[PDB]
Symmetry: D2
């Protein structure tokens, strides 16, 4: 029997009763009367799972089809780590199939690479690329740079004033003061040379710094706030218009990420014997190079691409990112890649391949990497959490694995297009 | 208990044990699909440096029937992505509860705040401006003089009619629009474009493209199909051609937020919002050398909806293309007009990950699951409008947070 | 005098002296050259060094065709050295290409590239498209309204009305399919049309003004914000010109025998291909280039443009070029080269092509003025010559870079 | 020997240095050229007599058959940094000089413009190649150390007095390494000076990495005379900014428009319009018109208008009543000089002398080139003001 709303408020308020005594229908009555907020259903109710169940029932009534959420799962999931960290207004979870592609022979080691995707043939094709690399002695990679960025926009009264601030940041003394404020916000914060650009009285400042094993967006944002506050002391007429003025650039296509790099800049390479190209990849070295020149270079050129000189790097990046608790929206910039191919060896029949990815935004701590299922996929690769002995080594290793797996995916798709 | 290799083969699955099946694989089929995943996980665990790595990677009680031979291979489980709800989104005199699969804290709550501002301001209106998935093969003739001849042939009415007949014959939803061609010496990049009903249409347009190129091969036997995709589509890479010509659904959305609502809900002013939009989304993206990235975080919303609704999440590269504009509005010039224009939303409600039941639950929330029989492509066009509208909600909230500081 | 100078001017200016007219301070003065002299004297007193104008020439130049047409506030002319590179063997013909430049070695290097092409059987070119553009921005009250205008222009009926207004302005005004693009309540409309032998910026601007007035009849709430909303795009870098084309889209090609690559170009075919891939494709890609997949197309375009009375500011878009190179022939030692230039903005009538010195350089190439029997043939031929000469320039410079 | 022989004697012998005199050498080359043209009378109105060919031969042009007169107009005074400039503009486009002159008048009545040079450094961007990507990565890291950069900086700076190497920018593409050398070049544009420093620098780098192959001294990473995002973001040559405030009264009477109309056209044309067109660095009306006209008049490399005209034009409301028009133009890659190339010729030096920037500034190296870059940016702003007013007024 559904009790009145006045009586239900007294039971929940009591210390030795709680929501346990109230029913499903009674809690739904309190939320609709604005006594209890729907987004705090986890804290008020005895368990996290029951809070999600109540929000699903509230949502179902609003929908045109009441049984819409029937096959959206929610039970037996660890909501404790998601609440107040990863998601709000939670109505369940979305299971994404995870396949394995390996072994990927990279830097004299072997990796079993997890790939969360619903695209048919993606895992198996990437697996074929790994097999070709394995029979060809393996791949080698190098991290060329490491530093997450934030690109605020500030505004001085005049262009003459903004020019003065740019010159001030360029002196050794001015940069030293701003570096002191930036680095004071975190243990891993080490500010590199600034990258500034004027647009009239506007000034776009590109802060860059390592962030341990974190992706580092929040850490670099906090350091940027303290740095601009210190700059405000020397220039009180400056106005911080936005902590992100799209000069970072985060989650949008931008030539600045392609040229300067953002996060981890990485390069991989391998040599596939002529026999391996024929038997595994069902093509030739000559055919692979001709498709790479006219698709990945000339084709992308005709399309007006900036940073998209590859076949499907975004497929591999997105799959690994979802599996390993990364920010999947950062696939925009993280998938930037140029794939090159040429002839090699004594008879000029072997296929040299390289992929260069200047802006892989990645981390093994914080965000979705705090969740246990996501940590399982990181644990496969041996990069879960922060490396204490060498800060940033786990995040750098994951970036190398992404670049190497992208190269495996490039080998297989380009071989499929060449053979027809 | 473990039997020899000879005794295990004569019996062979249900009779044998889990330990015996592992011995058969290493020596150099399964009853249920769930059991097949379990055997793959045990073999994988021995190869890893930490054998208990897959402990918290779930796999049991998941419907693998629709995944095997369709969506994923070498399957070792599934990855649960938390789904949240942001709504109601008042769009075209309707109300939508938008599912958002993400692990970024505050994304769903912030998008929900943007929805609240739109709802208190009378709502949003959107229009689909274009619709047509593309494929951009590269072919090659002996000379540039020959590739020019093929370009001119495709430009004639009768030449285009022959290629359109071959293309449209592959599917009942296939309707070939005007071709866009581009020469690079003896190379010729042909951009086929066509509606695909409610499907995203990559497989449908690829099939029509192969038949179209085969027909072109009859008139020009010296032509060589180098690649069915020559990166002129362009699929899953940044490209100005998608920005200018469009790819999939081109969409526009708009709303007017009362000055009262900008102050109380968004904690800012209309003047501050316009100033940040001009200097971040236009001038800022311009200084960064952006093509199509004239927005705050469209990619966050696109990606979250895409994962929840069984889309190709890798297509967020081009689908996130967006320009966000803001100006003063109303009789006192204090209200905030906002528009978002997304020329290349690549989306669908049939095929791929939308065949799975959990993904279909999120599509069913929006009322766009499956193929619309009475009006082909209506559900896919509706989902594209919902994405553009939710992106606009996300733009309002994030831009308000940046302006306020 | 002071008062007497005004009375004589009422009747003429020939009776008054140079110092008298300056005391007071085009149509007032009798001759055109005399008007330039008085303007130079007034300017000299304003300069910190009045002797600056000493070596800027002005006498004995035909100012009749420049006044009220090509330049204002004229104080003389700037002599640009003109050299000749050729013969350029193009489409079974031979061309002597004039090149106005002050860059040392440019003409001689381009001349070497021509020599390589000529010993290898010659080049062949094709015009792929033709149509100058104008890209206005209009504005409707809402995005729902701008979408209504876009759909209306896309129908056969709505396009027919706008095409009729556009085509009524000029003989050569023939409107091709429109290319529109929405940005909220804004609508950017790309009008395109051939323009005979003229570059066609004034002709397409007149057709666009009439087209937007006719569009306002059907949509009275529409506001023409600007006749150019940078969607053309004219004289700025833009991916739309690269993809859709602007003016003449052209391609050239040639096979250079292996012997010619060694003796004339002092390099090999293999060396040339490796530099082309890693400089013009990969190098330009790393630099974030849109349409700049070449060595120095801009050098050749600019030089020919100044010599032949073109708008040299249009080298921004006209120099768009992708240069490709691969192995060729039975032994795979011959060098196949092609250049593709999708947006050569060019003309042989109007503007600086009305001046006699500029017409001399056009007459060398056989493309001066309008082709009567085949309208647009002279402008198309000049675009083919530009693309062919660019290819000559690519061959020589790329060979110099490969050899080190 | 050559002086005694007639014009007709040398021409019939065939069917540079031997002629001795310059003008007669151009005359003989015109006659040989005439017999190859379908219309030999084409050269009639192409002038050549009475021109100083002494500075052109072996410096600026080859196979010379005359000169091309380009009309030069004057737009001014341009009130810039408490000074006044009469800006020469070589063009054949009707109304360009007069429109630019109107923009100068609007700036003059509004108190004048102010400019600042933000950066200075011509670049060359060679491509080198190591055997593997691991090797090219090693060279990148070596150049990034303080000791490695010091050795390369020593070889670069030894080639010239003005050669002072700045921080290198490198980019890997597999086994390729693209290295962007940058340095001031006094008052010269500096393409020749930076190329010589780059050659000696790569030779020193080869001592430490002998398997390195210099594929090309320019690998299109400079980037010279092609559109490139690297020039827009990092700058090339002179990076400059200008600004001015135009009173509401001046916008109405001189420019025939309003401040509100000018800002709306600038937002929707120069920002949103250029954005829709897929532009990188083309956020302006016609900076290229002004850059090209000044460049041809002042002996610059006109082909460098590709990168030099990169410009973003911004406009907003200003003043107490918010009715005045603030304008700014930012041009990050003005490639320019007042010594070398076409600036060696006397007519071109006349136009440089009008602006007071001809030749090399002895007391302050690079001051004349910097001043001319400020004048270009300021004149571009005048051109932006006038054309934008014409479009706004319809
Ligand atoms: C990525 C998967 C794997 C793939 C493959 C592929 O790799 N196939 C090989 C050979 O069958 C393979 C090998 C082992 C196991 C299974 C399959 N072929 C295609 C494909 C389809 C239609 C079409 F018209 C062009 C390519 N795709 C989908 C391509 C898309 O995800 C990005 C693509 O569109 C990006 C681009 O190339 O522009
Ligand atoms: C949208 C999310 C949640 C968000 C918000 C945000 O929406 N905040 C408001 C106010 O707190 C809010 C309102 C209701 C509920 C919860 C939170 N503020 C930031 C943020 C952080 C640091 C920083 F330096 C710049 C912005 N972010 C991260 C956005 C990023 O994913 C793309 C962003 O980096 C793209 C860009 O603007 O460049
Ligand atoms: C075309 C001109 C003449 C040229 C040549 C050239 O053609 N040289 C050959 C040498 O055999 C030649 C042949 C016959 C007659 C005379 C000279 N070599 C260079 C050059 C200089 C320095 C340097 F570091 C990189 C190239 N340049 C300057 C080109 C520039 O205007 C655009 C260039 O910067 C575009 C680019 O490649 O990025
Ligand atoms: C600057 C020149 C002179 C100019 C002017 C101009 O300045 N006009 C004013 C008012 O009449 C004026 C003031 C004083 C003296 C003489 C004339 N109006 C146009 C023009 C023509 C057609 C058309 F459809 C759009 C504008 N143009 C041509 C500009 C072109 O070279 C680049 C332009 O196309 C770049 C662009 O805006 O996209």
């Amino acid at each position: 029997e559904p009790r009145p709303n006045e009586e239900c408020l007294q039971i929940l308020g009591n210390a030795e009763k709680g929501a346990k005594f109230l029913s499903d229908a009674e809690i739904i009555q309190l939320v609709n009367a604005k006594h209890i907020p729907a987004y705090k259903l986890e804290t008020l109710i005895e368990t996290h799972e029951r809070g999600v169940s109540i929000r699903r029932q509230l949502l179902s009534k609003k929908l045109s089809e009441p049984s819409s959420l029937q096959y959206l799962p929610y039970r037996d999931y660890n909501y404790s780590l998601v609440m107040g960290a990863c998601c709000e207004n939670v109505i369940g979870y979305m299971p994404i199939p995870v396949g394995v592609a390996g072994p990927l022979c990279l830097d004299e080691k072997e990796f079993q690479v997890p790939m969360a995707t619903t695209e048919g043939c993606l895992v198996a094709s990437t697996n074929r690329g790994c097999r070709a690399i394995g029979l060809g002695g393996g791949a080698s990679s190098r991290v060329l740079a490491d530093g997450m960025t934030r690109g605020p926009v500030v505004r001085l009264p005049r262009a003459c004033d903004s020019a003065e601030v740019k010159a001030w940041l360029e002196t050794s003394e001015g940069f030293a003061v701003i570096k002191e404020a930036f680095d004071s916000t975190s243990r891993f914060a080490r500010l590199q040379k600034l990258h500034t650009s004027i647009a009239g009285r506007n000034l776009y400042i590109r802060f860059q710094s390592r962030s341990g094993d974190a992706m580092g967006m929040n850490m670099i944002s906090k350091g940027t706030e303290k740095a601009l506050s210190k700059l405000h002391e020397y220039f009180p007429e400056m106005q911080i218009l936005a902590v992100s003025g799209n000069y970072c650039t985060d989650k949008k296509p931008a030539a600045i990420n392609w040229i300067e790099g953002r996060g981890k800049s990485v390069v991989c390479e391998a040599v596939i014997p002529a026999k391996v190209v024929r038997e595994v990849l069902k093509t030739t070295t000559e055919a692979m190079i001709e498709v790479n020149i006219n698709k990945n270079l000339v084709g992308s050129a005709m399309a007006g691409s900036i940073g998209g000189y590859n076949a499907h790097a975004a497929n591999i990046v997105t799959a690994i990112y979802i599996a390993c608790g990364q920010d999947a929206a950062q696939n925009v910039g993280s998938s930037n890649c140029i794939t090159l191919m040429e002839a090699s060896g004594p008879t000029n029949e072997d296929l040299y391949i390289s992929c260069t990815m200047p802006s892989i935004e990645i981390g093994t701590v914080g965000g979705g990497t705090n969740l246990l299922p996501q940590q399982a996929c990181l644990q496969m690769l041996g990069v879960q959490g922060a490396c204490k002995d060498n800060p940033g080594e786990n995040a750098r290793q994951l970036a190398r694995i992404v670049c190497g797996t992208v190269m495996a995916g490039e080998l297989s798709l380009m071989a499929a297009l060449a053979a027809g």
